[PDB]
Amino acid sequence: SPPIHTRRQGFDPADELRAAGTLTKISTWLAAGHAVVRQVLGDHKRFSTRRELVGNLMDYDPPEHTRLRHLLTPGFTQRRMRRLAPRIEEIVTDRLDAMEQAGPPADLIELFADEVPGAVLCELIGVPRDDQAMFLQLCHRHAFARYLVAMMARERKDPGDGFIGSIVAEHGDTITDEELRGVCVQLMLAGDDNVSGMIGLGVLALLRHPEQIAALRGDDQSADRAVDELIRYLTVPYAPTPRTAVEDVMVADQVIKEGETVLCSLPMANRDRALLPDADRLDVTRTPVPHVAFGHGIHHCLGAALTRLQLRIAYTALWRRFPALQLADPAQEIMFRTSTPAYGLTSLLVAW
Numbered sequence: 001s002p003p004i005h006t007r008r009q010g011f012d013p014a015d016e017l018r019a020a021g022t023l024t025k026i027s028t029w030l031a032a033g034h035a036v037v038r039q040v041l042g043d044h045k046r047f048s049t050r051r052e053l054v055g056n057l058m059d060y061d062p063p064e065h066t067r068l069r070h071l072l073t074p075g076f077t078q079r080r081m082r083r084l085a086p087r088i089e090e091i092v093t094d095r096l097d098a099m100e101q102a103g104p105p106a107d108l109i110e111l112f113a114d115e116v117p118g119a120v121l122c123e124l125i126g127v128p129r130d131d132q133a134m135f136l137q138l139c140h141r142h143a144f145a146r147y148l149v150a151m152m153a154r155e156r157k158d159p160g161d162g163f164i165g166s167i168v169a170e171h172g173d174t175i176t177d178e179e180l181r182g183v184c185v186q187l188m189l190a191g192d193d194n195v196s197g198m199i200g201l202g203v204l205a206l207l208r209h210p211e212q213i214a215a216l217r218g219d220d221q222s223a224d225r226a227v228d229e230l231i232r233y234l235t236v237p238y239a240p241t242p243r244t245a246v247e248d249v250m251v252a253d254q255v256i257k258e259g260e261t262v263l264c265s266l267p268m269a270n271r272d273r274a275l276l277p278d279a280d281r282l283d284v285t286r287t288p289v290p291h292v293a294f295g296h297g298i299h300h301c302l303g304a305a306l307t308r309l310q311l312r313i314a315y316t317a318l319w320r321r322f323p324a325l326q327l328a329d330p331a332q333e334i335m336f337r338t339s340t341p342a343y344g345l346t347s348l349l350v351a352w
């Protein structure tokens with residue numbers, strides 16, 4: 001009953017999804033191989049992402065996409081995101097405190113996984129801390145757009161040095177308040193469900209492979225390689241933005257007609273034995289590979305650096321606080337999140 005590409009079995013793609021060919025028609029084309037997915041995503045000239053929506057990079061084609069992304073790129077680099085580390089550490093500590101105060105057992109998803117990403121996003125865009133609580137409540141449920149108008153008005157008149165402030169000070173003439181508001185809305189949508197899914201599933205994956213936890217508190221390479229492997233192995237998004245063929249195009253010896261849609265199975269592409277001979281195995285020590293969990297090509301995840309830093313901080317602080325982290329009952333059923341654009345957990349009752 002659920003769409004083929006959204007079906008999972010544990011941490012893995014479902015058997016019916018595994019049985020699918022490289023490129024087949026489904027009731028829409030489904031690309032389920034690493035090479036074919038990278039071909040489709042890398043072909044931005046023949047495959048368009050296009051179907052409010054203003055500021056949504058996933059709805060832009062070049063040169064319009066190139067222009068808008070250029071203004072956003074500098075505010076998403078590894079070095080710029082490293083500046084948020086203290087605040088991420090603070091947010092994570094606050095949520096760990098909430099778990100510790102509640103005492104064992106506690107729902108890691110409700111108290112930790114579903115709370116961290118939103119708070120980090122508020123810090124990213126520069127929402128004042130006192131307004132952050134109400135900002136998230138209005139955003140999660142669907143005044144929200146009305147608040148952002150007032151936020152852009154402050155920054156345009158008197159620019160700070162944050163995310164919005166740096167854009168309006170340097171390129172205020174080329175970007176509008178409507179575009180800035182749209183960017184912020186889309187950042188909330190693109191960077192909440194994905195990260196919350198990764199926090200939940202990553203914690204469980206590390207519990208299921210507990211010798212691999214120690215990699216997180218090693219040197220920079222050790223920790224980053226651990227996080228990237230978890231990103232690869234879990235591949236939380238089922239698909240990127242649907243790709244529409246602008247013209248007739250031959251992909252994998254099959255003709256994709258103009259107007260037809262192609263869905264890329266990111267989990268299948270990252271389990272492709274052409275990417276890794278043992279792709280179904282979790283190993284935090286393996287050298288990073290060109291996985292497509294953050295996409296491929298011009299639309300590749302803008303929040304990739306933020307995600308890597310946030311997840312590293314989240315996983316590391318969790319076990320530093322709770323070394324004896326465990327499932328509340330060893331035999332408890334894993335509660336998978338299946339109704340959102342990203343795979344995750346709805347609940348994870350943990351003890352320590």
Ligand code: HEM
Pocket residue numbers: 041049057058059069186187190191192194195198236237239240241242292293294295296298299300301302303304306307
């Ligand atoms: C679990 C972590 C994440 C994963 C797995 C993920 C996945 C992806 C993927 C697959 C794409 C490509 C979409 C496409 O080509 O159609 C993408 C794009 C994008 N992501 Fe993420 N994402 C994550 C976290 C974030 C975060 C935290 C942010 C916010 C800082 C973010 C912001 C964006 C934006 C703005 C785009 C559009 C880029 C463009 O179209 O040029 N993502 N993401």
